[PDB]
Amino acid sequence: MSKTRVIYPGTFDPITNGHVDLVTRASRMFDEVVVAIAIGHHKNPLFSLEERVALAQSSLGHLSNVEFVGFDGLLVNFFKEQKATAVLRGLRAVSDFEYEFQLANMNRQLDPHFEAVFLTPSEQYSFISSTLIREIARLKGDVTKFVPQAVVEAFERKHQQGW
Ligand SMILES: O=C1O[C@H]([C@@H](O)CO)C(O)=C1O
């Protein structure tokens, strides 16, 4: 009867209906969920940390047991700092599965308390990824069906400006 705390790390660049499904599913099984948004210094997220957090808070803030935090560094250092029970990840495809298996084993070797649990997407989100959504929006496609409305607007406002 100890409290459970799971971290869902990601770039969330941007958040999609698939991530929303995962976090909702997880919020029913664990006491606390942390949506952990990897800053990506030596990477190049299209959306800033502030935009990514706001887009996440706008789709998931209605769930009382969900928190939103930016992080960088080693996922296992964040894991220790957060006092987490586990990391959560979604597995969409075979390449996801192989990479995630390797990472779980590497993290367990860096921290023996480390744990990773996985969810499988509902089939209505199995074909949605952040990368593909970026590609369609860039080419002026409609992403309304795959992402929350606030993300649709954020793509319009990214066009409107230039950064
Ligand atoms: O959170 C993430 O979003 C995508 C993927 O989860 C979407 O399928 C990605 O590269 C992450 O780290």
Ligand SMILES: O=C1O[C@H]([C@@H](O)CO)C(O)=C1O
């Ligand atoms: O925040 C929102 O949730 C749905 C979206 O998840 C379905 O694409 C929608 O359109 C919003 O206004």
